[PDB]
Design a protein around this ligand. Sequence first.
Ligand SMILES: [Ca+2]
Ligand SMILES: [Ca+2]
Ligand SMILES: [Ca+2]
Ligand SMILES: [Ca+2]
Lengths: 144, 19
Amino acid sequence: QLTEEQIAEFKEAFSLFDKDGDGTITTKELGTVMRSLGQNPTEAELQDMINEVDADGNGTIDFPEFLTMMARKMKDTDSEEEIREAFRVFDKDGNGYISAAELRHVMTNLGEKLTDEEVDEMIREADIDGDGQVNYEELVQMMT
Amino acid sequence: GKFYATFLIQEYFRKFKKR
Ligand SMILES: [Ca+2]
Ligand SMILES: [Ca+2]
Ligand SMILES: [Ca+2]
Ligand SMILES: [Ca+2]
């Protein structure tokens, strides 16, 4: 059901949110990462994000809780609704296009260590119509 | 939600790096 590689990739996502590396995601850490990803959620919006996943109730998300939600979302969310949500993270100004500059910001934000050239290559590979940027449909074709 | 979208994005970067 879950290989070690899938588990470590789910840990890579968990680690981004648990910035102090103590095995727990707090609101403060959830708030910090969500703001770096363009968003700006409400203080209530952060405690019920934490809440919907914190299954034992200690007010915090450990990796077993996280791995349980990710395994369920992987089985429940449809493949198209999946990417739409990711696109909206990339398309930081909501104009319907992911530019190289927008992709660069997410790459640096998620601690990736890519060259400006490599990001350009990433855009090149998904750009199907040649306008130098990535729309929603182009994103789904690469992501699947 | 926002947790799974983040996984999807890190996978996109992963897939590219293998090329
Ligand atoms: Ca922590
Ligand atoms: Ca907990
Ligand atoms: Ca845009
Ligand atoms: Ca395009």
